[PDB]
Amino acid sequence: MKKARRSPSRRKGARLWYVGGSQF
Amino acid sequence: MYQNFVTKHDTAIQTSRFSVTGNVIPAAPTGNIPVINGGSITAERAVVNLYANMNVSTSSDGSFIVAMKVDTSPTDPNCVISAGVNLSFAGTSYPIVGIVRFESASEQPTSIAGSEVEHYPIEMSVGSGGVCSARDCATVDIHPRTSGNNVFVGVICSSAKWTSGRVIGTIATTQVIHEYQVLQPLK
Amino acid sequence: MYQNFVTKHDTAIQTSRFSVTGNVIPAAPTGNIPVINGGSITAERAVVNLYANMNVSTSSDGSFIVAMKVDTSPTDPNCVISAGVNLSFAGTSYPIVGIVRFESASEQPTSIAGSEVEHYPIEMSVGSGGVCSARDCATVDIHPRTSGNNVFVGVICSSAKWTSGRVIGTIATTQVIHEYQVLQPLK
Amino acid sequence: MYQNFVTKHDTAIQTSRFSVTGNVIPAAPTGNIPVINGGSITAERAVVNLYANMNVSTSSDGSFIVAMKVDTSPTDPNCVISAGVNLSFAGTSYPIVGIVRFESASEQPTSIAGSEVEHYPIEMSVGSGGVCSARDCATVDIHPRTSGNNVFVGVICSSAKWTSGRVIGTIATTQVIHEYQVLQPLK
Amino acid sequence: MYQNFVTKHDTAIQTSRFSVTGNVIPAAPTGNIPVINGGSITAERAVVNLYANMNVSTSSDGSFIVAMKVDTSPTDPNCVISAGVNLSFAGTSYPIVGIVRFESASEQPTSIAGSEVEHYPIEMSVGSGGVCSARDCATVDIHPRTSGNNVFVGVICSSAKWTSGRVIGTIATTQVIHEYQVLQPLK
Amino acid sequence: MYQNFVTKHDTAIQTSRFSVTGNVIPAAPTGNIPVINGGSITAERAVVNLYANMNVSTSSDGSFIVAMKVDTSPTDPNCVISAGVNLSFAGTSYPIVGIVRFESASEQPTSIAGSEVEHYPIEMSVGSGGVCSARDCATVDIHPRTSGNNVFVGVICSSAKWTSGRVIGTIATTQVIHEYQVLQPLK
Amino acid sequence: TEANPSNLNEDDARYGFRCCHLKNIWSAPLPPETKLAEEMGIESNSIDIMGLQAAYAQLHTEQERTYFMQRYRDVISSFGGSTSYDADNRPLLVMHTDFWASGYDVDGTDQSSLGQFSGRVQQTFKHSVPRFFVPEHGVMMTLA
């Protein structure tokens, strides 16, 4: 019940979001 | 603000109701107090609706009772008994209420000698000349004191000087052996 | 001192309001009680403003109702229903109030047979000849007992002997399924 | 909803009862206040039933007392004393009540000089012209201040202008040294 | 006994006071309710002292308001607003009170159209023909609903049938955004 | 049931008592309010017994004060001040009460200019034409605002229209800086 | 581009500007002006296939730009070059930390609150910037 509180990172795999540049 | 979920009296839900009509002849404690019930409910959940005529044939001062039978199943020595009343009288008589306890071998007592009634005073919300209101409770031993009787409890309404006229309201009363579950938004 | 954040009734905020004017013809329970609403709100958040004339055309004793529809979404069997009333009557009649429950296939009941109304007595703050005030609540089963009806709840105002005249005040009532968040200085 | 199990006054159960009848001659504090008891109970559990005639032979304004003897066993300096009253008077006199403390070498005081009575004001539920009701308590030192006396406590009923007539009700009072156990459905 | 440190309303200390004298012309909701203030305090801490003459020039039934401006700094959506009133009227009119909310681009509203006033009913302690008393609170959204207005809150006093005469008392009211620290002997 | 050990006002025990007799000439706030005390107690524990005659020599409307001196020892900015009153008036005048604060270089103020009195409204239990009752408290800053004065606190009793006649009751008041220890059967 | 803190609105000035939600399908869409079709003119009856070829190439440069090279610095990185932070006047990021904020629940214990809970989030954290050399006068700002 540690991870269950925090929405995953989806760090595995390639890049999905192209939005024009770096966005925090 | 936060909702207050605790109450001194919780009126029965959808059950134990009865409407009383006609005349109601109050009486002095020296005599036999009128138990205006033949259809006396008893889950010690009772809601009696009043739409009668307060008639002073006998005494000009006195009282009448609305009763309900106590469930004697519980092994607990005594439990709480709450009542909630709202009565508007046409004729100024300054009503007054309270909880009472009395035994009887009979299943449907039509009246009870004043000497056989036990009293339990309660916070009376209002006591104007024409309306008495109260919602409170009291502790009462629930087991039959005299082997073989049934135990009754209810509210009694008295007056120092009654006045012939119509009376209307609700006399609710219950023995707490269950607290009605309720939706509490934050749980 | 510390501020008391819990209350028996929380009046709706900015919503569910309606003003009732004109005449109000109270009726006896043997007949059909007046539901002085066609614009019956229902987030079971209701605030009805009164500035009408209490008229005794029908019966001299009786009652009228201010109702609001219950939200039956909750899976909980029953929830609390609070009301807050303040009524000043021009003609001494000793008002009296209480919460009620009644079903109807209709969306906007204009009246309801007295036999179809269920009662729930409440702590009545004041009950002088000219003004009745109360702020309390009661537990009520919220699901329709007869498949296909809508469930209504509200406060009823009765009297043993009404007196033609103006009446003014506010009849607020709400079904608790949300506790209004509030600023508590120490949190 | 949840049942409220705490109360400001718990009336004695099945014991310490007595009925007072006949006349009751109220008196001014400059004189000797009537202690309408010879059969003065004392588990400081007392329930006095009233069905008498308020008679103005002496003064037109004044008061009378219903007393009960305090148990002085407890080593605690002082304990709480609750009372519960409900009185309907036939003649408008605007009753008023309160808790009192007074000592006396006598076991059954029939009256007590007003100068020897100590007062303790209480939340008075109702105070209409014809009915006074209250259910509250106060803190009182229970040990005899003057070596050799008995300590009495009780409620006093006064009026600025009494009116000859019948009076009816119940004057219950108790010193808390025991909290009556009660069935709490959820334990 | 233990001292009760929580209260439904805490009157401002040494500040926000003002005395209102002269005449007060109550009005019907169809018109413009009198805001008997030009020196309208606003730490939403307000104590208004009344020693005026209730005059029925306009309508025989109606109401007047005592208001105070709300501090809209708090990011909290809404906070509690308590009021404490004590009014004795020379002429029997059966007063009635309650909390209200209304906006206005003006800094010192002298009156407000009844249609622009929002109501919040409160536990009314007493409502005799000559005196109304209450100490309670209600939840109210504190941010201006119409960009550019000021938010006012206060208590309103109404009557079904007023009676020309003197009125005297205190109308205190405050928005809780601070709980006054207090000496608690056991901490 | 469980005994309620918390109270809004705890009357002093065996100390700080005084009886007030004779006439009491109420006054309007524009003048100097009567402080019916020369033997002004002050452990801010005070119990004043009333058995006087309300006389309307000066104004027909107004008020009188029962005061007690505040102990300014505590370093705490402000503490709670409770009062408990029960007054029955022979002549219908609809009394009204409240807590007040006023300073004076004098040790035994016989009267105080109305302009120098600060008000604190309280839950008034009853306010019939003939009797006012209340048991409540309020927060008050206890340190002298003007270097060199004594701080007084007490309850004030006012009326829109007084009526010459006898008055009887008790005006108790105390500043909480000690909670009276009490026997609690279950500890 | 507000010129003075006084040109900022109530909320902004007191709490800071608003930022983007965490990235997801509905909060990280391709820039709103993303091309959905690229037209290429053609003589009434023929098409220059060589032009078509160039057309695509040109498009490619346009896309790359829209999708991820909207900032000058990123275009130059595209060529395998670099830019000082002075080139486009970008603040220099010295240290970036991120963490989850967890806590505990407080159990309600009175007659009505029994069985109720209130979440109190309380997280400890370290944010450490390694010895950094300040080449010119300026400010070291740290934000959350």
Side-chain angles (χ1 to χ4, degrees):
Chain A
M1 180 192 64
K2 310 141 284 68
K3 285 180 166 291
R5 296 189 185 309
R6 43 195 74 161
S7 180
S9 322
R10 281 87 161 175
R11 186 57 176 51
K12 270 116 64 188
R15 182 176 177 175
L16 285 60
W17 319 118
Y18 300 82
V19 84
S22 37
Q23 172 187 299
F24 271 119
Chain B
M1 292 179 268
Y2 291 104
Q3 171 64 213
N4 179 188
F5 297 112
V6 61
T7 182
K8 299 192 183 180
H9 165 78
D10 221 4
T11 315
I13 291 187
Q14 189 238 302
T15 68
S16 318
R17 291 203 170 49
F18 184 79
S19 299
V20 182
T21 53
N23 285 53
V24 46
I25 314 297
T30 61
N32 284 55
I33 295 69
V35 186
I36 66 193
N37 293 303
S40 222
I41 51 316
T42 171
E44 201 30 28
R45 240 42 191 284
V47 184
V48 161
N49 290 101
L50 262 192
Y51 186 77
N53 187 284
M54 213 66 225
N55 181 47
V56 183
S57 288
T58 299
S59 198
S60 48
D61 67 63
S63 40
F64 62 110
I65 297 175
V66 181
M68 34 181 17
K69 173 184 168 184
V70 172
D71 185 320
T72 65
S73 300
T75 56
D76 293 278
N78 29 62
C79 56
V80 47
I81 295 167
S82 66
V85 299
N86 277 320
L87 295 175
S88 182
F89 295 77
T92 60
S93 46
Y94 291 97
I96 208 178
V97 297
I99 319 294
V100 295
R101 170 186 200 294
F102 65 87
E103 303 180 1
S104 180
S106 176
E107 278 291 351
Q108 289 297 313
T110 50
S111 61
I112 185 56
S115 65
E116 294 302 85
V117 179
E118 185 155 297
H119 298 209
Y120 293 101
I122 61 181
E123 254 267 272
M124 191 161 204
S125 187
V126 308
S128 74
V131 65
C132 68
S133 170
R135 187 175 188 174
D136 200 299
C137 53
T139 310
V140 196
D141 73 307
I142 68 173
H143 299 308
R145 300 174 184 166
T146 315
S147 181
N149 297 340
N150 286 297
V151 171
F152 296 85
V153 160
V155 25
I156 178 179
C157 190
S158 310
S159 178
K161 185 175 76 178
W162 286 103
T163 299
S164 292
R166 167 167 297 305
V167 67
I168 186 180
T170 327
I171 305 300
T173 159
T174 86
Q175 116 180 59
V176 182
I177 62 177
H178 278 306
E179 297 176 68
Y180 275 151
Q181 55 180 306
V182 63
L183 183 179
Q184 300 176 53
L186 287 184
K187 286 180 175 175
Chain C
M1 292 179 268
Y2 291 104
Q3 171 64 213
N4 179 188
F5 297 112
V6 61
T7 182
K8 299 192 183 180
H9 165 78
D10 221 4
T11 315
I13 291 187
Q14 189 238 302
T15 68
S16 318
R17 291 203 170 49
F18 184 79
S19 299
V20 182
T21 53
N23 285 53
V24 46
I25 314 297
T30 61
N32 284 55
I33 295 69
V35 186
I36 66 193
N37 293 303
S40 222
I41 51 316
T42 171
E44 201 30 28
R45 240 42 191 284
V47 184
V48 161
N49 290 101
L50 262 192
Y51 186 77
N53 187 284
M54 213 67 225
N55 181 47
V56 183
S57 288
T58 299
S59 198
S60 48
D61 67 63
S63 40
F64 62 110
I65 297 175
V66 181
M68 34 181 17
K69 173 184 168 184
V70 172
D71 185 320
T72 65
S73 300
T75 56
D76 293 278
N78 29 62
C79 56
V80 47
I81 295 167
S82 66
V85 299
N86 277 320
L87 295 175
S88 182
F89 295 77
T92 60
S93 46
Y94 291 97
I96 208 178
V97 297
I99 319 294
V100 295
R101 170 186 200 294
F102 65 87
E103 303 180 1
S104 180
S106 176
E107 278 291 351
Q108 289 297 313
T110 50
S111 61
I112 185 56
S115 65
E116 294 302 85
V117 179
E118 185 155 297
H119 298 209
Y120 293 101
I122 61 181
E123 254 267 272
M124 191 161 204
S125 187
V126 308
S128 74
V131 65
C132 68
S133 170
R135 187 175 188 174
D136 200 299
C137 53
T139 310
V140 196
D141 73 307
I142 68 172
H143 299 308
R145 300 175 184 166
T146 315
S147 181
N149 297 340
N150 286 297
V151 171
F152 296 85
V153 160
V155 25
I156 178 179
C157 190
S158 310
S159 178
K161 185 175 76 178
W162 286 103
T163 299
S164 292
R166 167 167 297 305
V167 67
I168 186 180
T170 327
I171 305 300
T173 159
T174 86
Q175 116 180 59
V176 182
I177 62 177
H178 278 306
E179 297 176 68
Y180 275 151
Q181 55 180 306
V182 63
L183 183 179
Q184 300 175 53
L186 287 184
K187 286 180 175 175
Chain D
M1 292 179 268
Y2 291 104
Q3 171 64 213
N4 179 188
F5 297 112
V6 61
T7 182
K8 299 192 183 180
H9 165 78
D10 221 4
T11 315
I13 291 187
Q14 189 238 302
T15 68
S16 318
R17 291 203 170 49
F18 184 79
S19 299
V20 182
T21 53
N23 285 53
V24 46
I25 314 297
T30 61
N32 284 55
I33 295 69
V35 186
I36 66 193
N37 293 303
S40 222
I41 51 316
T42 171
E44 201 30 28
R45 240 42 191 284
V47 184
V48 161
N49 290 101
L50 262 192
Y51 186 77
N53 187 284
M54 213 66 225
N55 181 47
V56 183
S57 288
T58 299
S59 198
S60 48
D61 67 63
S63 40
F64 62 110
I65 297 175
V66 181
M68 34 181 17
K69 173 184 168 184
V70 172
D71 185 320
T72 65
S73 300
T75 56
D76 293 278
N78 29 62
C79 56
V80 47
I81 295 167
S82 66
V85 299
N86 277 320
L87 295 175
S88 182
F89 295 77
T92 60
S93 46
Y94 291 97
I96 208 178
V97 297
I99 319 294
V100 295
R101 170 186 200 294
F102 65 87
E103 303 180 1
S104 180
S106 176
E107 278 291 351
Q108 289 297 313
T110 50
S111 61
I112 185 56
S115 65
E116 294 302 85
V117 179
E118 185 155 297
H119 298 209
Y120 293 101
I122 61 181
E123 254 267 272
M124 191 161 204
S125 187
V126 308
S128 74
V131 65
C132 68
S133 170
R135 187 175 188 174
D136 200 299
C137 53
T139 310
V140 196
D141 73 307
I142 68 172
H143 299 308
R145 300 174 184 166
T146 315
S147 181
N149 297 340
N150 286 297
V151 171
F152 296 85
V153 160
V155 25
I156 178 179
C157 190
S158 310
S159 178
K161 185 175 76 178
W162 286 103
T163 299
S164 292
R166 167 167 297 305
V167 67
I168 186 180
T170 327
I171 305 300
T173 159
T174 86
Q175 116 180 59
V176 182
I177 62 177
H178 278 306
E179 297 176 68
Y180 275 151
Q181 55 180 306
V182 63
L183 183 179
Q184 300 175 53
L186 287 184
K187 286 180 175 175
Chain E
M1 292 179 268
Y2 291 104
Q3 171 64 213
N4 179 188
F5 297 112
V6 61
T7 182
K8 299 192 183 180
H9 165 78
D10 221 4
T11 315
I13 291 187
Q14 189 238 302
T15 68
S16 318
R17 291 203 170 49
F18 184 79
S19 299
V20 182
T21 53
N23 285 53
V24 46
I25 314 297
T30 61
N32 284 55
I33 295 69
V35 186
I36 66 193
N37 293 303
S40 222
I41 51 316
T42 171
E44 201 30 28
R45 240 42 191 284
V47 184
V48 161
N49 290 101
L50 262 192
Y51 186 77
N53 187 284
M54 213 66 225
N55 181 47
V56 183
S57 288
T58 299
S59 198
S60 48
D61 67 63
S63 40
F64 62 110
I65 297 175
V66 181
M68 34 181 17
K69 173 184 168 184
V70 172
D71 185 320
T72 65
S73 300
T75 56
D76 293 278
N78 29 62
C79 56
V80 47
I81 295 167
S82 66
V85 299
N86 277 320
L87 295 175
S88 182
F89 295 77
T92 60
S93 46
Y94 291 97
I96 208 178
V97 297
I99 319 294
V100 295
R101 170 186 200 294
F102 65 87
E103 303 180 1
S104 180
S106 176
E107 278 291 351
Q108 289 297 313
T110 50
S111 61
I112 185 56
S115 65
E116 294 302 85
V117 179
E118 185 155 297
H119 298 209
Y120 293 101
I122 61 181
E123 254 267 272
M124 191 161 204
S125 187
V126 308
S128 74
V131 65
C132 68
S133 170
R135 187 175 188 174
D136 200 299
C137 53
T139 310
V140 196
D141 73 307
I142 68 172
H143 299 308
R145 300 174 184 166
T146 315
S147 181
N149 297 340
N150 286 297
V151 171
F152 296 85
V153 160
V155 25
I156 178 179
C157 190
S158 310
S159 178
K161 185 175 76 178
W162 286 103
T163 299
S164 292
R166 167 167 297 305
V167 67
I168 186 180
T170 327
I171 305 300
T173 159
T174 86
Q175 116 180 59
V176 182
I177 62 177
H178 278 306
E179 297 176 68
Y180 275 151
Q181 55 180 306
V182 63
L183 183 179
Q184 300 176 53
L186 287 184
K187 286 180 175 175
Chain F
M1 292 179 268
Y2 291 104
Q3 171 64 213
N4 179 188
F5 297 112
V6 61
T7 182
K8 299 192 183 180
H9 165 78
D10 221 4
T11 315
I13 291 187
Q14 189 238 302
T15 68
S16 318
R17 291 203 170 49
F18 184 79
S19 299
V20 182
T21 53
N23 285 53
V24 46
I25 314 297
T30 61
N32 284 55
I33 295 69
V35 186
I36 66 193
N37 293 303
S40 222
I41 51 316
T42 171
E44 201 30 28
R45 240 42 191 284
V47 184
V48 161
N49 290 101
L50 262 192
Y51 186 77
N53 187 284
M54 213 66 225
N55 181 47
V56 183
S57 288
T58 299
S59 198
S60 48
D61 67 63
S63 40
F64 62 110
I65 297 175
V66 181
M68 34 181 17
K69 173 184 168 184
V70 172
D71 185 320
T72 65
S73 300
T75 56
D76 293 278
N78 29 62
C79 56
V80 47
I81 295 167
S82 66
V85 299
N86 277 320
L87 295 175
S88 182
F89 295 77
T92 60
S93 46
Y94 291 97
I96 208 178
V97 297
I99 319 294
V100 295
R101 170 186 200 294
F102 65 87
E103 303 180 1
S104 180
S106 176
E107 278 291 351
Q108 289 297 313
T110 50
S111 61
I112 185 56
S115 65
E116 294 302 85
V117 179
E118 185 155 297
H119 298 209
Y120 293 101
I122 61 181
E123 254 267 272
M124 191 161 204
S125 187
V126 308
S128 74
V131 65
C132 68
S133 170
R135 187 175 188 174
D136 200 299
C137 53
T139 310
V140 196
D141 73 307
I142 68 172
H143 299 308
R145 300 175 184 166
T146 315
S147 181
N149 297 340
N150 286 297
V151 171
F152 296 85
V153 160
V155 25
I156 178 179
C157 190
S158 310
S159 178
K161 185 175 76 178
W162 286 103
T163 299
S164 292
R166 167 167 297 305
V167 67
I168 186 180
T170 327
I171 305 300
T173 159
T174 86
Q175 116 180 59
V176 182
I177 62 177
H178 278 306
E179 297 176 68
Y180 275 151
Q181 55 180 306
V182 63
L183 183 179
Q184 300 175 53
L186 287 184
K187 286 180 175 175
Chain G
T1 178
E2 286 65 60
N4 301 54
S6 53
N7 293 167
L8 290 172
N9 73 72
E10 203 192 10
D11 295 320
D12 283 325
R14 304 180 296 178
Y15 316 130
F17 298 173
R18 312 163 50 184
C19 306
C20 306
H21 262 102
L22 289 290
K23 305 168 189 176
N24 61 44
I25 163 171
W26 62 260
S27 84
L30 284 5
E33 74 285 5
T34 298
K35 283 190 186 293
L36 287 184
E38 245 288 288
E39 297 302 327
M40 191 209 147
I42 47 188
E43 307 101 304
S44 209
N45 295 305
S46 61
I47 175 174
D48 175 13
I49 66 179
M50 285 181 102
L52 172 61
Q53 186 62 29
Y56 276 123
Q58 307 185 59
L59 170 57
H60 182 279
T61 108
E62 285 178 290
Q63 316 217 85
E64 256 188 349
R65 238 152 276 257
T66 293
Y67 295 138
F68 47 89
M69 294 193 265
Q70 277 189 48
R71 299 239 187 59
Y72 175 78
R73 46 185 167 88
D74 291 329
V75 169
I76 301 292
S77 286
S78 162
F79 284 65
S82 72
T83 61
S84 61
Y85 55 75
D86 278 318
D88 61 340
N89 259 57
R90 58 171 181 285
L92 173 46
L93 200 208
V94 178
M95 233 302 84
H96 169 50
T97 303
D98 75 315
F99 66 89
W100 296 97
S102 200
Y104 61 113
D105 282 318
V106 179
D107 307 324
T109 70
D110 87 45
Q111 194 173 183
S112 29
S113 74
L114 193 70
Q116 192 180 326
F117 311 87
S118 172
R120 177 187 199 185
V121 41
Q122 194 177 201
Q123 190 57 297
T124 9
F125 68 97
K126 295 188 179 187
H127 175 78
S128 40
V129 172
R131 192 160 300 302
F132 164 72
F133 174 65
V134 183
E136 308 181 64
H137 300 59
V139 194
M140 295 298 281
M141 291 183 74
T142 299
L143 323 74

